[PDB]
Amino acid sequence: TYQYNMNFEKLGKCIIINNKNFDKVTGMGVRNGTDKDAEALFKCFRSLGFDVIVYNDCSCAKMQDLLKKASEEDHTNAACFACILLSHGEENVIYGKDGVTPIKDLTAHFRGDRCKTLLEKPKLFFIQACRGTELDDGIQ
């Protein structure tokens, strides 16, 4: 009707990528506290009914690999899909431990023409990272 059908054996898979330590080359510091979030996110999404698995300090290749494999899994009995990214980031890109990779490439795998089992089902991405360097001063 007007809402997504949530009538499935499973709610969906929730992938949580938690990058805390980065390669010396990347020049990015350690994201302390990122574990405090991951645990909180893990508990939260588990409570909603997600079958959540967490991946730590992943190389760009790794992250690409995971999201690709997952898009190739069979989501026929899943109500939806959810992915969470906790890392360093910049405009349009996210950091792996070895470098950066385009967010659009990580999410493209789930396009309808590339992941039928999730066709017409919500695909959720939560990203906690930077998107630039500008700051917000506030007002009044």
């Binding site: 409570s47 991405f125 930077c130």
Partner: protein, 92 residues
Amino acid sequence: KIPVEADFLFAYSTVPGYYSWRSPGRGSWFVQALCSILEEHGKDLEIMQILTRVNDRVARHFESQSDDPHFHEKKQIPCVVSMLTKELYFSQ
């Protein structure tokens, strides 16, 4: 026929071009808010409502505090991008 780009939703911790504030002690602001709003209404509010509350919660309650006068008292607002075509509820 369905748009291959449809039914996607992105919940960014910050707007394009800005910084996301994480508290090495309590964790990032977006996640703190997202978790609290979830572990309290996740089962009874549509996805957009939840995210709006996270936006408000983040927009208000938080305000950075660092030495660098240029990184002192800064604010942050999350960004939600939606291609959903139905309402989303995590129940029933």
